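Standup notes
- HV: blocked on the assembly model, inputs below
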Amino acid sequence: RMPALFLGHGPMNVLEDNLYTRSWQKLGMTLPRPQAIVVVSAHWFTRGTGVTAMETLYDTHYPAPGSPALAQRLVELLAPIPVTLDKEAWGFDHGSWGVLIKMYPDADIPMVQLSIDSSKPAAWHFEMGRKLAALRDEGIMLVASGNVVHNLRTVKWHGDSSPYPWATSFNEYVKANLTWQGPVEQHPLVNYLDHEGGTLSNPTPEHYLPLLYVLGAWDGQEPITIPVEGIEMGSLSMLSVQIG
Amino acid sequence: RMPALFLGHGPMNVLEDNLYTRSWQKLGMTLPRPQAIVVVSAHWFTRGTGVTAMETLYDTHYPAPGSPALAQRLVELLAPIPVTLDKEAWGFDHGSWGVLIKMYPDADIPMVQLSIDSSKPAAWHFEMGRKLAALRDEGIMLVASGNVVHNLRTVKWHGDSSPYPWATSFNEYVKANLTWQGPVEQHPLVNYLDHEGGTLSNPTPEHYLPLLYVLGAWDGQEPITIPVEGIEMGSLSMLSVQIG
Ligand SMILES: [Zn+2]
Ligand SMILES: [Zn+2]
Ligand SMILES: [Zn+2]
Ligand SMILES: [Zn+2]
Ligand SMILES: [Zn+2]
């Protein structure tokens, strides 16, 4: 049974870097090797849900082989959710590419990209991870990447380095509610904009929503882990989450 | 009379970095301060020409004030070229943001973004810089950013560090033809795919085309300078060009 992973993304490198990259490389050594991976990124935020099997914007290159079989299986599992199927791969954002180059350096794990539907509310994205859960017993690792705090208008690129108190506030409300159980509509992490708090940490939903894909996939029983965490440049949250 | 600048973009930082960043900061200290700037990036590659006056994807933030006056003046100058006018700013690619944060750290120069028309041939993009030339006598600096060699399938992110010979070959054909004069249709840098050479260095045109915007703006008389140059990771060319 494969784990699902939400990674806070960014180290702005690298090669021989930091705590985060060593946590990614990390889980790539330590976690059960997947038959294939469904990648969810903050940066594939589209009207409607798209899927690529990667049979062919960003100053990056991650030549993982595609899995047309997993793509079709994704489309079927999601039906009647209408899915658009791209032939070509989508470019990987620097952050996602940064997680993947550290995690599985050799780009030898077959892969599908899944996009996040803009037009849908948080509860729906949580329901998505509920549907993706079945794939975890079929040798498939879910890797979602984004940032539970993500306001680049508040980011302090040089000085000083302490976490803004509102950043730590929202982040702790995230961590304290990972294991919440009950109706989806009443989930604190689904109703995240109910926090002070919420809109300032996430003025648009895309960097936060990927966590819900991972949380949607939790059975209520298996452990939930935090392989690495951190708030960089005052408001970039680096909170990573392991399900199972 | 304002200079036009093509910058090869990437240092993957920074703050206290390298030769390239110090060349950018650099020209920002040394060049005549502009009333406003038209930014052209490799990464705004669209069907049709777009313009933003910046009255409102990338893990970046460059809060330069817009210039609606320059935007309208751009639309008028280009007519009958059909232009789409966005209210909102487009996100800056890391490379462009990297050039601008070093060049004009304070983000206090008014600014317009101009996009590159996908559907048009190299000669047309050269003609674009011919039209943009007039704005140089109106206090306006053209800043184009991309990379005259740009194949991320050949990039050696770690080892070793020597420039591929084909990379140096195409690059030198670029440099040897900056000052070429004659009919546009017969310009070596317009007919760049005529080199061995060309398609391998530039499998799609977007990172190269921005130079033509700058070269289009040369009168035949003023100096053409190379403020910095370099080939990193075997095939990322860092060749920068100053017109006037
Ligand atoms: Zn680029
Ligand atoms: Zn980037
Ligand atoms: Zn954000
Ligand atoms: Zn991001
Ligand atoms: Zn390229």
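- HV (later): unblocked. Chain B touches chain A through 19 residues (CB under 8 Å). Chain B has seven helices and ten strands.
- Next: hand off to the docking folks.
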